[PDB]
Amino acid sequence: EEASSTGRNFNVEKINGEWHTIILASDKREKIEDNGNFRLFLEQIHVLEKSLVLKFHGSELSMVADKTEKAGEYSVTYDGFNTFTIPKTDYDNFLMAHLINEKDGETFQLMGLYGREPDLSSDIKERFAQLCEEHGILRENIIDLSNA
Ligand SMILES: COc1nccnc1CC(C)C
């Protein structure tokens, strides 16, 4: 079974626990390149009543994302103001996130593919490339980080 965070049947509790950054994508590639502030390696998502605690490394980094007024959307302050949703997850293998960052009057889109294991199948990675395409993000702006 698959779900979107904005969908009626989304079960947020089911995204709790271990996750790993597998692929990141951005319409501003610099943000996820070697010195980019968004080249972050997820470790876990802790689901709370009205928020998600996101644990990364990039040193250890912890972030609290709060529910917004629209179901399935969360906001967090990090290098600007961010809002994100989860357009597709199967809970047990993969999680695809779409994030909008606003900083200094500008914006960019970040997309992420996260896995329960430190890597994912090529088929799932292809589905992620398709989702990026739907959001106007070129494959050349998709960076596989599973070997990094
Ligand atoms: C600030 O968020 C992020 N930063 C870097 C990579 N991925 C995300 C998305 C979260 C939802 C896992």
In sequence order, what are the beta bridge partners of 143?
24
Question: What is the whole-number distance in angstroms between the Cα of residue 21 and the centre of ligand 1?
Answer: 9
Length of the chain, please?
A: 148
Q: Do 72 and 63 form a contact (C-beta atoms < 8 A)? A: no
How would you list the strands of the sheet with 17-18, edge to edge? 17-18, 41-47, 51-57, 60-67, 74-77, 81-89, 94-103, 106-115, 20-26, 142-144
Q: Resolution in angstroms for this experimental structure?
A: 1.6
Ligand 1 contact, 15 CB (< 6 A): no
DSSP three-state, residue 32: helix
* Domain of 1, in residue numbers: 1-148
Residue 82 CB less than 6 A away from ligand 1: yes
Nearest to 86 by CA among 107, 104, 65, 106: 65
In the chain, how many domains are there? 1
Which CATH number do you get for residue 9? 2.40.128.20
For 103, the token pair is 């900083």
Method by which the model was determined: X-ray
Could you say which DSSP state residue 99 is in?
A: E
- Tokens 């600007």 found at: 80
84 and 74 Cβ atoms separated by less than 8 Å: yes
By alpha-carbon position, which residue is closest to atom 7 of ligand 1?
Answer: 112
